[PDB]
Amino acid sequence: LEQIFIESNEHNSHNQISQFRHAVVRNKCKHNPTLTNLSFDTPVYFSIDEVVTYLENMNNEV
Amino acid sequence: LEQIFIESNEHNSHNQISQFRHAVVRNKCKHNPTLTNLSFDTPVYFSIDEVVTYLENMNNEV
């Protein structure tokens, strides 16, 4: 995932990856509610455009 | 600072590090009001016990 969607030139790459994973996990959860113990590395369906929207909102926040 | 206060065998690093930085920068800006454009690496006074207080408080939130 990271090697696809990201390049680590971001000095603050930490602060980016954190939110990336947070949003991924929440999307997994709400898209598959019957289960638990979800994690970044879990193979279940989840959306992408929603993650992007989430990040936009985070970036244009007041 | 990292090599001193931290070990790298924890993947929560992507969050621990960011919060540690934020706290350090805030204390720096606090004890040195006059100046600006500060950052993590600026060589100026800053207490640390207060940083530990901050981390405890944050780890015990609800």
Side-chain angles (χ1 to χ4, degrees):
Chain A
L1 292 163
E2 302 179 273
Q3 177 159 312
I4 280 281
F5 290 126
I6 292 187
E7 297 153 30
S8 168
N9 65 272
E10 304 305 335
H11 40 273
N12 63 60
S13 43
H14 303 308
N15 199 27
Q16 312 189 348
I17 300 156
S18 182
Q19 316 305 269
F20 188 63
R21 302 160 76 116
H22 189 238
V24 161
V25 169
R26 302 309 192 159
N27 180 243
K28 297 204 170 175
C29 288
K30 75 181 275 294
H31 263 271
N32 306 306
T34 76
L35 319 179
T36 74
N37 301 338
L38 299 181
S39 164
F40 201 51
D41 50 323
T42 305
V44 297
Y45 185 73
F46 88 100
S47 188
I48 190 67
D49 296 329
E50 295 182 353
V51 169
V52 179
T53 295
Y54 179 106
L55 288 175
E56 301 157 52
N57 280 350
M58 191 62 41
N59 208 354
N60 307 288
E61 214 176 39
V62 178
Chain B
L1 294 157
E2 297 196 16
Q3 200 155 287
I4 280 173
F5 296 112
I6 295 169
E7 292 149 27
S8 173
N9 53 339
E10 294 178 353
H11 293 87
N12 194 29
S13 59
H14 287 349
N15 296 316
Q16 305 176 329
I17 300 168
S18 185
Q19 282 282 310
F20 185 40
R21 299 200 184 207
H22 188 308
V24 173
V25 177
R26 283 279 79 219
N27 187 293
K28 284 200 178 157
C29 288
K30 160 166 184 207
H31 287 259
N32 292 265
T34 67
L35 318 183
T36 51
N37 293 319
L38 314 190
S39 185
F40 186 73
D41 293 330
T42 293
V44 294
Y45 179 80
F46 72 98
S47 162
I48 186 155
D49 307 320
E50 310 174 7
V51 180
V52 163
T53 306
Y54 182 81
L55 293 174
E56 280 195 37
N57 271 330
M58 266 194 64
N59 200 357
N60 291 335
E61 287 182 352
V62 159

